[PDB]
C-alpha cells in the first residue's frame, strides 16, 4: 500500500530457497546461526526472521540504523521502529534530546504492550545501534505510567500538571518546543515528545471535554487533523520522586554551596534536584539518585525474540570507541576538581556494557545471538544472495547494467529498479527505453511482473541479486552513486517587558517600565501599564498599547524624557531626516518605473528537466517564491526582489533556477558574494545542478590564477560565460558584460559601502535578486512593499534540532573530550577567542589539549589574503579546529562544524552568543555548544543572569527575543541604505522606521500627491483568571485595540476562545467597548465620558437643527453645547426608586443607540450583545 | 614559491646584500596555461584525454574491464564472460 | 621534547603531531606508533632510540635537530629508516 511500498518486491525475494532456509532454521530457535551475505541483504534477512516473530536488529552506526529502519518500514510500515541512540554520553553533563527520550520510552512501552493500539501496530522488527544496545537502563522505566489524555477521561486537572512536571516537562506560558506545556483556566496545552503537533485539551470540571491539535506559530487549532488518545511519555529517562529529592538533598549536604549558585556546577544541579525541579545533566547521577540493578535493552524484548547483529566486526570496534569515549566523559565531568569538593566508580553502573557482556546478557535472557557478516567463514550459513552492479561514475556501465536487465527479463525473470527519490522514477523509465527495454512504474506494494522491468518508488539503499528467486534488484544509488535518505510546520509566531526595561511612548518618549497594575473606579477594574519618567510615573491604559514600543537603539542607555515639549522636537527633526531616505527608496522605483528593461520569455523544456534534478522536495514557500521570481522576470518592469529565510531553507536553489532561466533567453547572469568562500561554495552548487546542460560557469575569487582570471573570467564580453560567481573583483571598472540579464547578490550588508553603491547603479538597468538570512520586521516588510518586493520562506525542508548547550566553568578535560567527540565523527569545531593579541597563545593551548588536531587561528587583523586562505583550508577540511573571533565565526557556513567552544562566554552579549551558536548544528548532525567562564575569577551577577538565561535556549521573552530584534537592526539598516543612529538613538528603532513607513507612503503617494477615550462605568478588562501570563494578556489587549473592524474584532475573539476558553463577562464587556470605539471612529467621536454619576458627555459633535430638535424629543434632559461642541445627556435608570443608573452592556448599548440617532442612523441598526 | 622564499630568504643568507629572489623566480614553474600557450606557439597541439564525460568532446567507445576487487565470484564470472566471448566468436 | 612538538605545530598547523620517547610507558608508545603507522598522525617527534626501530614505508623525510651532537653511525642509521620504498 502507500505505507509499505516494497512489501511485494521483498515477498518476491522471500521465494528464494536460501532465505526460506533461514526461515526454517530460525523457527527452531537455535543457539547459534551465522549468516554470510552482502550488506544490501540486511532488509531481506531481517524480513525473513520477522516471519517467525519479533526480533531486534543491531547496526553499527546510527546512520546504518536509520537506513535499515527506513528499508524495513517500506515492507512492514508502523510494525518496525528504531530504538534511537543518545546524542550524549551516559555520564555527560548534557541531557539527550527530549524527542530521543520520547521515542526510546515509547518503543519500550510498545514492547511491553503489543496490543495497545493507541501506541501503534505490534512490533515486528526493532532496529538499534551498538550504543543503545550497550547502554544499560533502569528496569522500572516502562512501569512509569504516562499521562493518557482521551476525550471523556475523568481526571483531576491539578494532578495532571503535577504528574507532567514529574515526567520532566518544563512548564511555560506558551508551548513552543516538545516537552513544554502551558496551563490556562480550564485548558491544558501540551507537546508530547513523540507527537507531530501539540494538543490543546479542554477541561470541564474533572473531565476532558475536547481535544484538538494546534500549530506552534499562530497558536491556534488545526481542525483537519483528528486527535485520538495522546500518550505523554516522560521527557527524561527517570521519574521525579520524593526519594530522588531526598537523595539529592543527602547528596546536597555534600557539595552544599547554598549561595552564589554558579549555573553549570554540581551544587546548582543538586540544589535544584532537592527542590524537585528536573535539570539538565541529571541522567549522569542516576546511579546515585535512583540506585537499582541495571538491565539491558534485550530484557524488554518478548521472550524468545532473537537478536541479529549485522557486521559483528564493526560493532565490536564501535563498542570500543563508545566505551573509551564514555570513560573520557566520565573522568572529565566528574573529576575531583570538576565537582568542587561522589565516586566515579559508583556511576559506572550506568556506563556502557561491553560487547561480550551484552551477548551473554542476551542469551541468559532467552534471546538468541545471531550474526550477519560480509566476510565468509566456513562455519557460517551462506545465502545465495549477491550485491548489484554499481555504475560508479560510468555511463557505459549504466548501459551495461540496463543491457543486463534486458537479458534477464528476456529469460523471463524478475527485474525491479527501486528509486527512493521523487521524480526519479520517470527518468529511469526513460533511461530504460533508450536502452531498448520495456519498463513500467509499478503501483506501491506490488511485485514486478516477469518479462518487463518494474520501476518501484521505495526505500532501498543498494541493489541485490538472487538467482534462486530469478530476481535482480537495482537501486538508483547503484545507478548514480549518490545516497538519499530523505511537509513541515511554519516558524514566525509580541512584546515582553521586565522591571527596568526602557520603552518608547509616541507622545511622551523614553520611559522605564515598572509594573503592571490594576486600579478600580467604582467596581470597574481597569488594567494599567506604568512607566517611570524623569522630572514621575505615567499610567498608559489598555487602549493605548499601540502607542508603546520597546526601546531598541543606543547601546548606551538613553535618558528619560518628561512632560515638556522637547520630546516633540526630537520627533520632528528625526522625521525631517527620514524623508530623505524614503525619497531615494522610491526614486529607484521611479527609475524602475519607466526603465525599458527587456522582459524574459517563458520556461523552456530544459528548465523543466533541470528543476527535477533537485535532490530534495521543494517547500511551499520556496515554490511560491520561485513563482514570484519567475513572474517578475516575465513582466517588463525590471526586477528587484529580496528573499528572506534562515540558512538551508532553499534560497540559493531559487537563485540557480532564476539564473538558469535567464540563460535560456540568451543572457548571462552575475552572482555577487562578499567573501571568496561563498564564491567557491556557490560555484560548486551551480556547476553541480547545472551539469549535463551546455552552461559554462566560471568563478572570480581572490585566488583564481591570472592565467584564467583576466583570460576566461573577465572575458565576459565574449558571451561564452553563462554565469559568473565572484566577489568584488566583478565590480571593478575593467569588467564588461555583453547582455547582462540578471544579477544575484548574497549578503549585501557585508559588501563595501563603495561596492554597495556600485551595485545600486546596476539595480536600475537589469533584474536583480538578493538573498538575506537576517529578517526584517513585518512593519517595514509591508511599509516598503511599494518600492521593493520581498519574499519569505518560513517552511524548513528538514527539521532543525536545537544544539545541546552546556554552560559552566572552563575545564580542560571537558573541552578535550568534546573536541575529540566532534573529531571522531570527522567533524570540525569553532574555538572562539576575541583577544587577538593572545589568540596564537590560545590556539597553542588547544593543541596541548588535543595534540592530534590541526588547529589554526583567524582574525580580522590578518590581511584578507591569509585570512580567506585560512578559511578556505578550513572548509576543505585541512584544519579540524578553527580558533577565531566572533566576527570571523559569524559569517562562515561550515556545515561540518558542529561543535562550538566559547572561551570567556561571560564577556559576550546575548545576541552574540545566539549568533555564534547558530553557526553549528544546522545540518542533520546534532550540534554542541560550550559557553565557558573562567574559574580563577568571581563571575559577575550580571553575567550569571546573562549566562543563566542562555542555559535554557527556550527563551521566549527572556532576552533572546529582545536579541532577535537586534539581528533585524543590521537587516533594516542594510535595506535602508546605511544606518544612521544619530536620530535612531533618542527616538527608538521601531519609532524610527515607523516614520520610514510614513515617509515612504508619503512618497509612494506621489501620483496622488496628498484614538478615542471612553471613560464609562463599565467593568471592562481581562481578568487574570482568564489569562494568567501578563505577557500574553497584554498582547490580547493590544490586538483587540488594533482591530480596525468588526470582522477583525470577531477574529480576535475567536482566537481568545480557542487559546484561553470562553470569554468571561468582563472580557465580553471590553469587546463591546472596543466595538463602540469603532462606531465612534465612523462618526469621528473622540471622547465619551461620564461627567458625573448621572450624565455622560460625547465630546466632538456639531448638530444641525434637525439633530438638535431630535435630541430633545428622543432624549429628555440632554442638551447640546455648541461652544465646546459636546452633547451632554443624562443616564436613564434601570429599576424604579428614589434606582441605580444603568451600567455595563446596557449602557454600552444605550450609548451606541445615542450615537446612531444623533447621526441619522436608527437606534436599532447594531447591538453589542454579540460575544 | 615556498622553497624559493625559504632557501634564499634574507634571514637564511645573512649577507650584506640581498639575493634577488624575483630574478630566480623567473626560471621556476610556468603556469599551466603558459605551457599550453608555449606549446601551441611552437607548433605543438594541446589535446586531452579525460575520464570525466564532456559532451563538447569526443567520447570513445571504450569501456573499463571488470575488476576482481577480491571477489571470487568476479573471478569465475569473468572466466564465464571471456569463455562466452570466444564462444560467441 | 614537549616544547619541540609545540614549535612544529605552530610551523605546520595542518599536520597532526605527537611525541614518542623512552620515558613513556610501553602502552603509550605502542599505541602512538600504531596510529602513526595507520596514518592517524603526520609528524612523529621522537628520540633516536625509537626512530631507529620503526619501519614506516610512508615516512620519507627526516628532520634532525642539532645533528652536530650525533655520531656518524647514529646519523647513518637515522637516515637509513627513511626513503626505503619507491618514493625518494
Contacts of C45 (CB under 8 A, 6+ apart): C1, C4, C5, C8, C17, C18, C19, C20
Inter-chain contact C41–A852, Cβ cutoff 8 Å?
Answer: yes
Q: What is the DSSP string of A465-479?
A: EEGGGTEEEEEHHHH
- Tell me how far apart the terminal alpha carbons of chain B are, to the nearest angstrom: 58
Q: Return the closest-CA partner of residue A1074 out of A1059, A1061, A1063.
A: A1063
Distance, CA of A5 to CA of A9 (rounded, Å):
9
Written as nine digits, the cell of A783 is 511599509
CA A521 to chain centroid, in Å, comes to: 46
CB distance A1035 to A956 below 8 Å: no
Of A851, A873, A879, the CB nearest to C17: A851
Distance, CA of A872 to CA of A459 (rounded, Å):
36
CB distance A303 to A297 below 8 Å: no
Kind plus residue range of the DSSP H or E element containing C79? helix C72-79
Mutate to test the interface with A, among C2, C7, C9 (most CBs of A within 10 A): C9
Block residue for cell numbers 522491468:
A453
Distance, CA of A644 to CA of A773 (rounded, Å):
6
Distance, CA of A179 to CA of A102 (rounded, Å):
9
Strands A548-550 and A502-505: antiparallel
Distance, CA of A657 to CA of A622 (rounded, Å):
11
CB distance A853 to A819 below 8 Å: yes
CA atoms within 13 A on the CB side of A842: 23
Inter-chain contact C9–A855, Cβ cutoff 8 Å?
Answer: yes
Give φ, ψ of A529 to 5 degrees.
-105, 125
Mutate to test the interface with C, among A321, A852, A877, A879 (most CBs of C within 10 A): A852
Distance, CA of A274 to CA of A253 (rounded, Å):
10
Inter-chain contact A705–B55, Cβ cutoff 8 Å?
Answer: no
Distance, CA of A844 to CA of A840 (rounded, Å):
6
Using CA atoms, how far residue A769 sits from A339, A518, A544, in Å, is 55, 51, 40
Distance, CA of A538 to CA of A525 (rounded, Å):
18
Chain interruptions in chain A, by residue before each (C–N > 2.5 Å): 341, 486, 493, 535, 1010, 1138
Interface of A with B in 679-738 (CB under 8 A): 692, 694, 705, 707-708, 711
CB distance A517 to A527 below 8 Å: yes
* CA-based nearest distance A707→chain B, Å: 6
Written as nine digits, the cell of A933 is 567562564
- Coil, helix or strand at residue A877: coil
Cα pseudo-dihedral A620, A621, A623, A625, rounded to 10? 170
Residue B32: its chain A contacts at CB < 8 A?
707
Distance, CA of C16 to CA of A355 (rounded, Å):
31
CA A274 to chain centroid, in Å, comes to: 33
CA A87 to chain centroid, in Å, comes to: 19
Distance, CA of A368 to CA of A55 (rounded, Å):
10
Residue C35: its chain A contacts at CB < 8 A?
852
Which chain C residue shows the shortest CA-CA distance from A883?
C13
> Can you name the residues that pair with A1141 across neighbouring β-strands?
A1133
- Coil, helix or strand at residue A1143: coil
* CA-based nearest distance A25→chain C, Å: 41
Q: Is the dihedral of CA A229, A234, A235, A237 positive or negative?
A: negative
Of B33, B53, B73, the CB nearest to A395: B53
Give φ, ψ of A1131 to 5 degrees.
-70, 135
Inter-chain contact C5–A851, Cβ cutoff 8 Å?
Answer: yes
Q: How many CB atoms lie within 10 A of CB A689?
A: 20
Mutate to test the interface with B, among A707, A711, A720, A722 (most CBs of B within 10 A): A707
Which chain B residue shows the shortest CA-CA distance from A374?
B71
Give φ, ψ of A381 to 5 degrees.
-75, 125
The answer, yes or no, to whether C and B have at least 3 beta-carbon pairs within 8 Å is no
Inter-chain contact A707–B33, Cβ cutoff 8 Å?
Answer: yes
Q: At what angle do helices A989-1004 and A566-591 cross, to 10 degrees?
A: 50
* CA-based nearest distance B16→chain A, Å: 30
Using CA atoms, how far residue A287 sits from A140, A166, A343, A781, C15, in Å, is 13, 18, 11, 54, 42
Distance, CA of A963 to CA of A908 (rounded, Å):
12
In sequence order, what E strands does A877-922 have? 881-884, 897-902
> Can you name the residues that pair with A929 across neighbouring β-strands?
A805, A900
Inter-chain contact B34–A395, Cβ cutoff 8 Å?
Answer: no
Distance, CA of A496 to CA of A1031 (rounded, Å):
6
Q: Which residues of A999-1022 are buried (b: 16+ CB within 10 A; e: fewer)?
A: bbebbbeeeeeeebebbbbbbbbb
Q: CA geometry: angle at A998 spanning A997 and A999, to 5°?
A: 95
CB distance A207 to A154 below 8 Å: yes
Of A386, A397, A692, the CB nearest to B73: A386
Distance, CA of A1105 to CA of A1111 (rounded, Å):
10
Interface of A with C in 875-904 (CB under 8 A): 878-879
- Looking at residue A881, the DSSP 8-state letter turns out to be E
Contacts of B47 (CB under 8 A, 6+ apart): none
Quick check: B53 contacting A, CB < 8 Å? yes
Using CA atoms, how far residue B81 sits from A266, A403, A479, A793, B77, in Å, is 69, 14, 22, 55, 6
Q: Return the closest-CA partner of residue C4 out of C22, C18, C16.
A: C18
Written as nine digits, the cell of A481 is 552513486
Residue A879: burial class (beta carbons within 10 Å; 0-12, 13-18, 19+): buried
Written as nine digits, the cell of C59 is 615516512
Written as nine digits, the cell of B79 is 572466466
CB distance A776 to A975 below 8 Å: yes
Q: Which residues of A1048-1066 are buried (b: 16+ CB within 10 A; e: fewer)?
A: ebeebbebbebbbbebbeb
Written as nine digits, the cell of A765 is 538597468
Block residue for cell numbers 565468509:
A376
> Can you name the residues that pair with A768 across neighbouring β-strands?
A640, A743
Q: At what angle do helices A17-27 and A42-49 cross, to 10 degrees?
A: 40
Distance, CA of A1144 to CA of A851 (rounded, Å):
77
Of A400, A694, A707, the CB nearest to B34: A707
Distance, CA of A1098 to CA of A1101 (rounded, Å):
7
Which chain B residue shows the shortest CA-CA distance from A711?
B33
CB distance A1003 to A789 below 8 Å: no
Q: What is the DSSP string of A241-284?
A: -HHHHHHHHHHHHSS---SS--TTSHHHHHHHHHHT---TTGGG
* Maximum distance among all Cα pairs of chain B, rounded to whole angstroms: 81
**Could you tell me how many helices (H) and strands (E) chain B has, helices first?**
4, 0
CA atoms within 13 A on the CB side of A522: 11
Cα pseudo-dihedral A961, A964, A966, A970, rounded to 10? -170
Distance, CA of B82 to CA of B87 (rounded, Å):
8
CB distance A1000 to A584 below 8 Å: no
CA A796 to chain centroid, in Å, comes to: 7
Q: CA geometry: angle at B62 spanning B59 and B64, to 5°?
A: 125
Mutate to test the interface with A, among C1, C10, C13, C44 (most CBs of A within 10 A): C13
Which chain C residue shows the shortest CA-CA distance from A873?
C14
Q: Which residue pairs, CB below 8 angstroms and at least 24 apart, start in A424-430?
A: A424/A476, A425/A455, A425/A457, A427/A612, A428/A455, A428/A476, A428/A479, A429/A455
CA A1088 to chain centroid, in Å, comes to: 47
Distance, CA of B9 to CA of B21 (rounded, Å):
8
Q: How many CB atoms lie within 10 A of CB A605?
A: 8
Distance, CA of A329 to CA of A88 (rounded, Å):
10
The answer, yes or no, to whether C and A have at least 3 beta-carbon pairs within 8 Å is yes
Written as nine digits, the cell of A1116 is 429628555
Using CA atoms, how far residue A193 sits from A7, A104, A197, A862, A990, in Å, is 30, 10, 10, 47, 37
Strands A509-520 and A640-644: unpaired
Contacts of A293 (CB under 8 A, 6+ apart): A139
Q: Is the dihedral of CA C8, C14, C15, C16 positive or negative?
A: positive
> Can you name the residues that pair with A308 across neighbouring β-strands?
A57, A370
CB distance A580 to A998 below 8 Å: no
Inter-chain contact C16–A847, Cβ cutoff 8 Å?
Answer: no
Residue A711: its chain B contacts at CB < 8 A?
33
* CA-based nearest distance A465→chain B, Å: 13
Q: What is the DSSP string of A313-325?
A: HHHHHHHHHHHHH
CB distance A193 to A233 below 8 Å: yes
Q: Return the closest-CA partner of residue A310 out of A268, A368, A364, A370.
A: A370
Quick check: A598 contacting B, CB < 8 Å? no
Give φ, ψ of A1090 to 5 degrees.
-90, 110
Q: How many CB atoms lie within 10 A of CB A979?
A: 14
Give φ, ψ of A145 to 5 degrees.
-70, 125
Which chain C residue shows the shortest CA-CA distance from A855?
C13
Written as nine digits, the cell of A252 is 546536597
Written as nine digits, the cell of A163 is 504528574
In sequence order, what E strands does chain C have? 17-20, 43-46
Q: What is the DSSP string of B57-70?
A: S---S--PPP--TT
Amino acid at each position: 500500500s502507500v505505507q509499505t511500498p516494497i512489501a511485494g518486491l521483498v515477498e518476491l525475494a522471500l521465494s528464494d530457497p536460501s532465505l526460506q532456509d533461514v526461515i526454517r532454521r530460525a523457527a527452531d530457535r537455535p543457539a547459534d546461526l551465522a549468516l554470510v551475505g552482502p550488506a544490501s541483504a540486511r532488509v531481506l534477512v531481517a524480513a525473513a526472521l520477522a516471519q517467525n516473530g519479533p526480533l531486534l536488529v543491531v547496526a553499527a552506526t546510527g546512520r546504518e540504523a536509520d537506513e535499515l529502519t527506513a528499508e524495513l518500514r517500506g515492507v512492514f510500515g508502523d510494525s518496525v521502529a528504531l530504538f534511537p541512540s543518545w546524542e550524549t554520553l551516559p555520564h555527560e553533563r548534557l541531557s539527550p534530546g527530549v524527542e530521543t527520550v520520547g521515542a526510546r520510552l515509547m518503543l519500550l512501552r510498545r514492547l511491553a504492550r503489543p496490543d495497545d493500539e493507541t501506541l501503534g501496530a505490534p512490533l515486528r522488527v526493532v532496529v538499534t545501534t551498538t550504543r543503545s544496545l550497550l547502554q544499560p537502563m533502569a528496569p522500572d522505566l516502562v512501569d512509569i505510567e504516562p499521562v493518557t489524555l482521551s476525550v471523556g477521561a475523568e481526571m483531576e486537572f491539578e494532578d495532571v500538571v503535577a504528574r507532567l512536571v514529574d515526567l520532566s516537562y518544563t512548564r511555560v506560558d506558551m508551548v513552543g518546543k516538545r516537552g513544554e506545556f502551558a496551563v490556562r483556566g480550564g485548558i491544558l496545552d501540551v507537546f508530547p515528545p513523540t507527537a507531530e503537533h501539540p494538543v490543546r485539551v479542554e477541561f470541564w470540571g474533572d473531565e476532558i471535554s475536547e481535544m484538538r491539535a494546534f500549530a506552534i506559530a499562530d497558536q491556534r487549532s488545526i481542525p483537519e487533523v483528528p486527535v485520538q488518545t495522546v500518550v505523554a511519555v516522560p521527557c527524561r529517562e527517570l521519574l521525579m520522586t520524593d526519594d530522588v529529592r531526598e537523595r539529592a538533598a543527602a547528596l546536597a549536604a555534600e557539595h552544599p554551596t547554598t549561595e552564589n549558585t554558579v549555573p553549570g556546577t554540581v551544587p546548582d544541579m543538586l540544589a535544584k534536584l532537592a527542590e524537585g525541579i528536573p535539570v539538565d545533566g541529571m541522567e549522569a547521577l542516576l546511579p546515585l539518585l535512583h540506585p537499582i540493578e541495571p538491565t539491558t535493552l534485550t530484557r524488554h524484548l518478548p521472550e524468545g525474540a532473537p537478536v541479529l547483529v549485522c557486521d559483528p566486526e564493526k560493532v565490536r570496534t564501535r563498542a570500543a570507541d563508545l566505551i573509551k569515549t564514555g570513560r573520557e566523559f566520565l573522568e572529565a565531568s566528574w573529576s575531583t576538581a570538576a565537582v568542587g569538593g561522589i565516586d566515579l566508580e559508583a556511576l559506572g553502573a550506568s556506563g556502557f556494557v561491553t560487547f561480550e557482556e551484552a551477548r551473554e546478557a542476551a542469551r541468559e535472557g532467552g534471546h538468541p545471538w545471531w550474526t550477519l557478516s560480509q566476510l565468509s567463514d566456513e562455519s557460517a550459513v551462506e545465502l545465495d544472495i549477491r550485491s548489484a552492479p554499481s555504475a560508479r561514475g560510468s555511463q557505459h556501465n549504466l548501459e551495461e547494467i540496463f543491457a543486463m536487465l534486458r537479458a534477464h527479463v528476456a529469460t523471463g525473470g524478475y527485474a525491479a529498479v527501486v528509486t527512493p527519490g521523487i521524480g526519479t522514477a520517470h527518468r529511469v523509465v526513460e533511461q530504460l527505453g533508450e536502452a531498448d527495454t520495456a519498463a513500467t512504474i509499478l503501483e506501491p506494494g506490488t511485485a514486478p511482473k516477469a518479462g518487463v522491468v518494474g520501476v518501484l518508488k521505495g526505500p532501498l539503499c543498494s541493489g541485490v541479486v538472487l538467482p534462486g528467486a530469478n530476481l535482480v534488484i537495482i537501486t538508483e544509488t547503484d545507478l548514480t552513486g549518490n545516497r538519499v535518505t530523505a511537509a513541515a510546520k511554519r516558524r514566525n509566531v509580541p512584546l515582553a517587558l521586565t522591571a527596568g526595561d526602557l520603552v518608547v511612548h509616541d507622545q511622551h518618549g523614553i520611559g522605564k517600565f515598572v509594573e503592571m497594575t490594576e486600579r478600580v473606579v467604582g467596581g470597574a477594574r481597569r488594567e494599567y501599564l506604568v512607566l517611570e519618567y524623569a522630572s514621575d510615573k505615567l499610567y498608559v491604559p489598555m487602549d493605548s498599547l499601540d502607542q508603546l514600543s520597546r526601546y531598541v537603539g543606543g547601546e548606551a542607555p538613553s535618558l528619560s524624557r518628561l512632560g515638556g515639549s522637547d520630546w516633540a522636537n526630537t520627533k520632528t527633526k528625526a522625521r525631517r531626516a527620514v524623508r530623505e531616505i524614503a525619497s531615494e527608496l522610491v526614486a529607484l522605483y521611479a527609475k524602475r518605473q519607466s526603465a525599458p528593461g527587456h522582459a524574459f520569455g517563458p520556461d523552456t523544456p530544459w528548465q523543466a528537466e533541470m528543476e527535477d534534478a533537485f535532490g530534495f522536495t521543494e517547500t511551499i514557500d520556496q515554490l511560491t517564491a520561485i513563482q514570484e521570481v519567475k513572474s517578475d522576470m516575465e513582466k517588463p518592469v525590471p526586477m528587484d526582489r529580496v528573499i528572506c529565510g534562515d540558512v538551508g531553507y532553499g534560497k540559493t536553489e531559487i537563485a540557480v533556477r532564476a539564473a538558469f532561466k535567464a540563460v535560456q533567453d540568451g543572457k548571462q547572469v552575475a552572482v555577487l558574494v562578499p567573501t571568496t568562500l561563498l564564491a567557491d561554495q556557490h560555484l560548486q552548487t551551480f556547476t553541480n545542478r547545472m551539469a549535463g546542460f551546455p552552461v559554462t560557469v566560471k568563478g572570480l575569487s581572490r585566488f583564481t590564477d591570472p592565467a584564467e582570471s583576466r583570460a576566461v573570467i573577465e572575458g565576459l564580453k565574449d558571451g561564452s560565460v553563462d554565469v559568473v560567481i565572484g566577489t568584488h573583483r566583478l565590480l571593478q571598472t575593467g569588467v564588461t558584460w555583453k547582455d547582462l540579464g540578471l544579477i544575484i547578490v548574497d549578503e549585501e550588508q557585508r559588501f563595501g559601502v563603495e561596492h554597495k553603491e556600485h551595485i545600486k547603479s546596476m539595480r536600475t538597468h537589469v533584474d536583480v535578486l538578493t538573498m538575506s538570512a537576517t529578517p526584517i520586521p513585518r512593519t517595514l516588510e509591508m511599509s516598503l512593499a511599494g518600492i521593493r518586493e520581498m519574499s519569505t520562506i518560513l517552511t524548513p525542508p528538514e527539521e532543525r534540532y536545537p544544539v545541546l548547550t552546556y554552560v559552566g566553568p572552563h575545564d580542560d578535560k571537558q573541552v578535550a573530550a568534546a573536541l575529540r567527540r566532534e573529531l571522531l565523527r570527522d567533524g570540525q569545531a569553532f574555538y572562539i577567542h576575541n583577544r587577538v593579541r593572545t589568540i596564537d597563545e590560545a590556539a597553542a593551548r588547544v593543541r596541548q589539549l588535543v595534540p592530534e588536531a590541526r588547529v589554526v587561528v583567524a582574525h580580522g587583523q590578518m590581511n584578507e589574503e591569509t585570512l580567506e586562505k585560512t578559511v578556505e583550508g578550513f572548509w576543505n577540511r585541512e584544519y579540524d579546529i578553527l580558533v577565531c573571533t566572533t566576527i570571523v565565526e559569524t559569517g562562515l557556513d561550515i556545515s561540518n562544524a558542529n561543535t562550538l567552544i566559547v572561551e570567556r562566554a561571560d564577556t559576550f552579549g546575548l545576541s552574540q552568543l545566539h549568533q555564534l551558536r547558530g553557526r553549528v548544528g544546522r545540518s542533520r548532525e546534532r550540534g554542541y555548544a560550550y559557553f565557558l567562564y573562567p574559574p580563577n575569577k568571581p563571575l559577575t551577577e550580571t553575567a550569571y543572569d546573562r549566562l543563566a538565561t542562555i542555559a535554557q535556549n527556550n527563551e521566549l521573552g527572556a532576552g533572546m527575543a529582545v536579541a532577535m530584534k537586534d539581528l533585524e537592526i543590521r537587516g533594516a539598516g542594510n535595506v535602508l541604505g546605511a544606518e544612521q543612529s544619530g536620530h535612531v538613538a533618542g527616538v527608538g528603532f521601531d519609532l524610527y522606521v515607523r516614520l520610514v513607513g510614513e515617509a515612504v507612503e508619503a512618497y509612494r503617494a506621489a501620483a496622488d500627491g496628498k484614538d478615542v477615550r471612553i471613560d464609562l462605568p463599565v467593568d471592562a478588562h481581562l481578568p487574570p483568571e482568564y489569562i494568567g501570563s501578563d505577557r500574553l494578556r497584554l498582547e490580547a489587549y493590544r490586538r483587540l485595540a488594533a482591530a480596525a473592524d468588526d470582522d477583525a474584532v470577531a477574529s480576535v475573539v475567536d482566537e481568545l476562545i480557542d487559546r484561553y476558553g470562553p470569554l468571561p463577562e468582563p472580557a465580553q464587556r471590553l469587546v463591546a467597548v472596543a466595538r463602540l470605539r469603532l462606531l465612534c471612529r465612523e462618526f469621528g467621536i473622540t471622547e465619551i465620558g461620564a461627567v458625573s454619576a448621572s450624565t455622560v458627555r460625547l465630546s466632538p459633535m456639531v448638530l444641525p437643527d434637525s439633530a438638535q430638535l431630535r435630541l430633545k424629543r428622543m432624549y429628555p434632559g440632554g442638551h447640546y453645547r455648541a461652544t465646546t461642541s459636546t452633547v451632554q445627556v443624562p443616564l436613564p435608570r434601570a429599576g424604579e426608586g428614589v434606582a441605580p443608573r444603568i451600567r455595563d452592556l446596557e449602557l454600552v448599548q444605550w450609548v451606541a443607540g445615542l450615537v446612531l440617532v444623533l447621526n441619522g442612523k436608527g437606534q436599532g441598526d447594531v447591538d453589542m450583545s454579540k460575544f | 614559491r615556498e622553497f624559493l622564499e625559504a632557501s634564499w630568504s634574507t634571514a637564511a643568507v645573512g649577507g650584506d646584500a640581498p639575493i634577488d629572489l624575483e630574478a630566480l623566480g623567473a626560471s621556476g614553474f610556468v603556469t599551466f596555461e603558459e605551457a599550453r600557450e608555449a606549446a601551441r606557439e611552437g607548433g605543438h597541439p594541446w589535446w586531452t584525454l579525460s575520464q570525466l564525460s564532456d559532451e563538447s568532446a569526443v567520447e570513445l567507445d571504450i569501456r573499463s574491464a571488470p575488476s576482481a576487487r577480491g571477489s571470487q565470484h568476479n573471478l569465475e564470472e569473468i572466466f564465464a564472460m571471456l569463455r562466452a566471448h570466444v564462444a560467441t566468436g
